[PDB]
Amino acid sequence: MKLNISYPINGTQKCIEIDDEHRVRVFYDKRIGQEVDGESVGDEFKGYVFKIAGGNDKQGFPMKQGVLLPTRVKLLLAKGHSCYRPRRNGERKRKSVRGAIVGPDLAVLALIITKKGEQEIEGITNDTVPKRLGPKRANNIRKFFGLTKEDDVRDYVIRREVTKGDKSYTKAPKIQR
Amino acid sequence: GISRDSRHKRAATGAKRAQFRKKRKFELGRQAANTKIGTKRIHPVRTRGGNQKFRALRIETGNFSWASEGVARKTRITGVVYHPSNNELVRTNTLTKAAIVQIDATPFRQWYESHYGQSLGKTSKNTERKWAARAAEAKIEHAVDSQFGAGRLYAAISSRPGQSGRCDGYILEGEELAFYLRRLTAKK
Amino acid sequence: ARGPKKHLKRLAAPHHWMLDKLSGCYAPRPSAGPHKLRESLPLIVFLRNRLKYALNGREVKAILMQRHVKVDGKVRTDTTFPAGFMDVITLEATNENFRLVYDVKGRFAVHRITDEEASYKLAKVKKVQLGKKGIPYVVTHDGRTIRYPDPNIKVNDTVKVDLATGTITDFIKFDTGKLVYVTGGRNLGRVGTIVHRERHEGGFDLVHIKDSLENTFVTRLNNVFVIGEPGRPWISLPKGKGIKLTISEERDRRRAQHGL
RNA sequence: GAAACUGCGAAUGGCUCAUUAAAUCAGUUAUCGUUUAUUUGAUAGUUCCUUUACUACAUGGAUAUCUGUGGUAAUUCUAGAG
RNA sequence: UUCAUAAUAACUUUUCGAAUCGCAUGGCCUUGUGCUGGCGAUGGUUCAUUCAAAUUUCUGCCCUAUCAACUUUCGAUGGUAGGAUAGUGGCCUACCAUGGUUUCAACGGGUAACGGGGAAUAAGGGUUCGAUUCCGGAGAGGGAGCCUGAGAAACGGCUACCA
Ligand SMILES: [Mg+2]
Ligand SMILES: [Mg+2]
Ligand SMILES: [Mg+2]
Ligand SMILES: [Mg+2]
Ligand SMILES: [Mg+2]
Ligand SMILES: [Mg+2]
Ligand SMILES: [Mg+2]
Ligand SMILES: [Mg+2]
Ligand SMILES: [Mg+2]
Ligand SMILES: [Mg+2]
Ligand SMILES: [Mg+2]
Ligand SMILES: [Mg+2]
Ligand SMILES: [Mg+2]
Ligand SMILES: [Mg+2]
Ligand SMILES: [Mg+2]
Ligand SMILES: [Mg+2]
User: Fold this and answer.
1) What is the rounded distance in angstroms from the CA atom of residue B56 to the CA atom of residue B41?
2) Locate the RNA-binding S4 domain: which residues (chain C) (predicted)?
3) CA angle at A173 for the pair A170 and A176, rounded to the nearest 5°
4) Which ligand is nearest to the CA of B49?
5) Rounded CA gap, C184 and B69, in Å?
6) Under a CB-based contact definition with an 8 Å cutoff, are residues C78 and C31 in contact?
7) SS3 C130
8) CB C19 within 8 A of CB C10
9) What is the DSSP string of B25-38?
10) Is residue C180 within 8 Å of residue C227, measured between CB atoms?
């Protein structure tokens, strides 16, 4: 089934389709938050290792963390929980949700790559996705720079330039605190 | 869901009132605290108009006051020995208001020792002159000395742990204590 | 209803706002403020209706927003502000100053009153209490809480707030033979002198009032507002001074004073 | 100035008369028997705890919006990553 | 009034006591980013006031006796203590007392009964109507249960059963 792999440090990710019944066999009976070696999921995944963080059932129901069940169940979710977003304040809703144990009923497996392996993936182990925007709070910028705090962080704010086609203009965030 | 409205009760005459309206929210009643002893565990409850209330189930220590010389000290509740409403709470060690409990009684003891120094159960010149000015006026009655020798004081709680969350009360003393010993001797 | 009510249908508005029973389904509900809504007067009513300076709701909103209304020396930019009895409304445009006092028909009449006296205001003492740290304080009918009052100021008494600093300037002690105003019931707008104040142990004090025309009535003490000493009112009484001419006397006034 | 977070209202208004015969309601009282966002008027030095070593010229981490990957036939369904 | 308030002893899984925004940015010269400094906007503890909300006293309701006794083991009336309540209160629990209403119609039954301000009718007395333009109450298919908030047992809010 579909596997959504995500490398955090490169900040990249991809979707991979697998049809063989045996590469996914190791994913069976493995709950969210566990680690599975990359040798047993693909001969191109040598050295790799997969943290399992959520997924989607064949009916589209996501798997909630800490359900420890290989089936679906109806749960009364509220604010703070996953698999639900409340519209009104304190609006509890009873919704279906897949259990945290991975079984054959799954359709997408959300997987983090943790350890860099031997054979490199196309654009995940190689390419890096830049951060879309930098820090905003003053001390956050200082920490992101290691700026020896008493150094007038005023100027060191990043400044993104965009060209309208006729005018090049700068846009930089306002520093809070 | 526990209502406290008067509608469900019969009329003074005795007629069975028909249901006028489904019970409201400003008439609600919540579960009893039925507090216990040990491992302090107070749960906040958000009541009408904010105004946090504190359920004080499983409370071990609290403030207790002595009326004669009027001094308050934090001390441990050690079991309940009498309850004027239901002895079942006594058997289950459920602590509610007006219950009668025993006190570790040490803090009162060395407060007395550092305050009068009469060596119950059987220095700087300033302290000596204070004691001389006191002139052995600490003639507190005999029964409290008896349980001081025993080591456990007899206190009656006065705070409501169900609402306040605290565990405050006052020692039985004077004729008060007398009365309850009679009742306790009825238990004995 | 489950919670506060925020709409005032037109017929349910007090008959002293005395609006038009047609031309509208609702009436301006006064927002929470210094006066009871039954006794108060929204600024929109005072401007659109009493003064006709505006024409409708938008005009009153524009008037209040640009900070030309000053209720007791403060702006009060909300349309339904409850400008109640004895409040002062200042318009720097037209440099005009009004004080709300009932005309003897019993209505909030438009009383153009001078700038010099517009500096201060009168108030009735509704409570005298001791707040935290043993600090005496006095609560007037506006809800103004004046701290550190004169030690012999008592309840039902009257005070003269300077309305600039908001402190106590002078006060009048309630007792017999004293000029007085009425603020409720059939005797709205009536002005007289206290002849007797029967106690009635257990509640609901009553006072007897005799006016200049030598007519006599009786009114509740909650309903009473001492206004000064006889012959020397502490404010400028409205036209007619609240004598409550009889209907036949009013007809004779219409017939006699008549020029067209 | 979209979106989203935050705040506030959504308990007002509108409709109907099914239930209800000391029930509702009306007039008249009481709350020295209580909660009260808001509006209005006032309202606080002590947060030091042994004060002869602290950020007060400003303390920390997430988090939506967004960038991208999806799932379900579909619902104001939303899981993973930054 | 055990009130307002004050004071002593203590207590707290220690609430608040501005690390927030806009405009104008003046004065002092200790002439530096130095010292101060106005008008507001949001907050914020407490006490008042207002919008209120809950209860609450007396009196008042249509027909029916082919409804004369009704209520209490399951609260019926009261006592005490506790629990819960925002708060009084059999509102609930524990233990006691056996009490409360009734021929001045209680209790039960009926209402093609929501109550009222009012409408028709009109010598006077009255008779009938009042679902509906205002005030109250109740309800969102029938039932229960609840989160958020100051305020809901909310339903153009959720949970479950029944249809
Ligand atoms: Mg309504
Ligand atoms: Mg009946
Ligand atoms: Mg007191
Ligand atoms: Mg009681
Ligand atoms: Mg009717
Ligand atoms: Mg009906
Ligand atoms: Mg009707
Ligand atoms: Mg009908
Ligand atoms: Mg209505
Ligand atoms: Mg409803
Ligand atoms: Mg229907
Ligand atoms: Mg709110
Ligand atoms: Mg409902
Ligand atoms: Mg609807
Ligand atoms: Mg509605
Ligand atoms: Mg909803």
Assistant:
1) 7
2) 41-105
3) 155
4) 12
5) 57
6) yes
7) strand
8) yes
9) STTEEPPP--B-SS
10) yes
Distance B5 CA to E60 C1' (A): 25
Residue type for C18, please?
M
End-to-end CA distance of chain B, in Å? 42
In sign, the C-alpha dihedral spanning A157, A158, A162, A166 is positive
Residues C140, C126: contact at Cβ < 8 Å? yes
Rounded distance, CA B99 to CA B103, Å?
A: 13
Nucleotides of D under 7 A from a protein CB: 10-14, 19-24, 29-30, 35-43, 58-61, 66-72, 74-82
Q: In angstroms, how far apart are the furthest CA atoms of chain C? A: 67
Please tell me the distance from the alpha carbon of residue A170 to that of residue A158, in angstroms, as a whole number. 10
Q: Of C25, C27, C5, whose CA–CA distance to C14 is shortest?
A: C27
Q: How far apart are CA A117 and CA A121, in angstroms?
A: 9
Q: Chain E positions under 7 Å from a protein CB?
A: 4-6, 8-13, 21, 46-56, 70-71, 75-77, 80-87, 89-94, 99-101, 106-108, 133-140, 143-155, 157-160
Enumerate domains of chain C plus CATH numbers: 1-116 (3.10.290.10), 121-171 (2.40.50.740), 174-244 (2.30.30.30)
Sheet strands (E) in C36-82 = 69-71
* Residues 34-53 (B) near nucleic chain E, CB < 7 A: 40-43, 45-51, 53
The letter for the amino acid at C157 is D
| Domain boundaries defined on chain B | 1-30, 31-105+152-188, 106-151
What's the CA-to-centroid distance between A136 and ligand 10, angstroms?
48
A3 to each of A14, A54, A108, C234, how far by Cα in Å? 8, 11, 5, 88
Q: Under a CB-based contact definition with an 8 Å cutoff, are residues A36 and A49 in contact?
A: yes
- The CATH number, out of the four listed (1.10.168.20, 1.10.10.10, 3.10.20.70, 1.10.260.40), of the domain defined by the range B106-151: 1.10.168.20
Distance CA B107, CA B102 (A): 14
Phi, psi of B84, rounded to the nearest 5 degrees = -70, -15
Instruction: List residues bridging with B43 in a β-sheet.
Output: B55
Q: How far apart are CA A60 and CA A107, in angstroms?
A: 8
CA–CA dist C233, C185 (Å, integer): 22
Can you spell out the DSSP letters for chain A? -EEEEEETTTTEEEEEE---TTTGGGGTT-BTT-EEESTTT-TT-TT-EEEEEEEEETTSPBBPTT---SSEEEEEE-TTSSS---SSTT--EEEEEE-SB--TTEEEEEEEEEE--SSPPSSSSS--PPPSS---BHHHHHHHHT--SSS-TTTTS--EEEE-SS-EEEE-PPPB-
Q: Residue C123 corresponds to which tokens in the numbers above?
A: 């108030």
Whether the beta carbon of C132 falls within 7 A of nucleic chain D: the reply is yes
> Could you give phi then psi for residue A95, rounded to 5 degrees?
-125, 155
One DSSP character per residue, B90-140 reads HHTT-B-TT-EEEE--HHHHHHHHHHT---TT---HHHHHHHHHHTT----
- Alpha carbon distance B118, B112 (integer Å): 8
Closest C-alpha among C156, C158, C176, C178 to residue C231: C178
Tokens representing C252 are: 């004779």
3-class state of residue C242 by DSSP: coil
